[PDB]
């Protein structure tokens, strides 16, 4: 054991686990999931007395883990066992594909109005417990290059046209589970080389949510240290879940 020295003490024996996940989606205009996956890591912050034998347990085999590497300290069989390094460290890393919760659904509508206007309406739907708040929401809607001007109306949030980036950017501070919001935009067009079709790129989203899209859930973290005169009941334990978008594109 060259990751942990030997004579460590704390009055207050406490650990913290952070489940951190990226959720990636590509969706067809109809509503097919063309591709989706989740990448995750568990980080541990441990203030435990001595040299303890810990046993981590989650709802494995219930969700399905395609593959996962571990940290040196991990003894391999068939559940997870280790003596943690003190302070903060990455315990495991993992990937997921099956039975993913997709926190948001995006429904685009587009209509051409002669050669002069584009009519665009996008709806977002939150798909998770109403107890829970998504935050830092962005919806990115692309605009053509012959764009003269853009009008938006949105009842929730704020939105501005970013001519430099060729995109309408809609931002929302917080939104609760099982809910609906929509933006309307009218895009004014300059005339153009006639046989330019618009390659309508996807509408993309960013968001953060307080749960693991993978479905993963922490079940126990058991600490035993045989010499010293604390037990398991004496340790204070916490989890938090932080789920964030990676590539989250819906094709309009």
């Amino acid at each position: 054991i060259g990751w942990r020295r030997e004579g460590i003490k704390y009055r207050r024996n406490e650990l913290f686990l952070d489940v951190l996940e990226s959720v990636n989606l590509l969706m067809s205009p109809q509503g097919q999931v063309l591709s989706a996956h989740v990448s995750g890591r568990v980080v541990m912050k441990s203030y435990l007395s001595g040299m303890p034998e810990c046993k981590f347990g989650m709802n494995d085999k219930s969700i399905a883990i395609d593959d996962c590497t571990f940290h040196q300290c991990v003894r391999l069989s068939r559940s997870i066992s280790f003596i943690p390094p003190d302070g903060e460290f990455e315990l495991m890393r993992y990937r997921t594909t099956k039975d993913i919760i997709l926190p948001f659904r995006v429904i685009p509508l587009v209509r051409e109005v002669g050669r002069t206007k584009l009519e665009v309406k996008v709806v977002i739907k939150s798909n998770f417990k109403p107890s829970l708040l998504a935050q830092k929401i962005e919806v990115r809607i692309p605009t053509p290059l012959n764009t003269s001007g853009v009008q938006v109306i949105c009842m929730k949030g704020k939105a501005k046209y970013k001519a430099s980036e060729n995109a309408i950017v809609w931002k929302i501070k917080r939104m609760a589970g099982m809910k609906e919001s929509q933006i309307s935009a009218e895009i004014e067009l300059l005339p153009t080389n006639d046989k330019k079709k618009w390659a309508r790129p996807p509408i993309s989203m960013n968001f953060e949510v307080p749960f693991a899209p993978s479905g993963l859930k922490v079940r126990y973290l058991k600490v035993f240290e045989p010499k010293l005169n604390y037990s398991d009941h004496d340790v204070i334990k916490w989890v938090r879940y932080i789920g964030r978008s990676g590539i989250y594109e819906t094709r309009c």
Binding site: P210, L221, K237, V239
Partner: peptide
Amino acid sequence: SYRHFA
């Protein structure tokens, strides 16, 4: 948000 396990 840092909650106990159960």
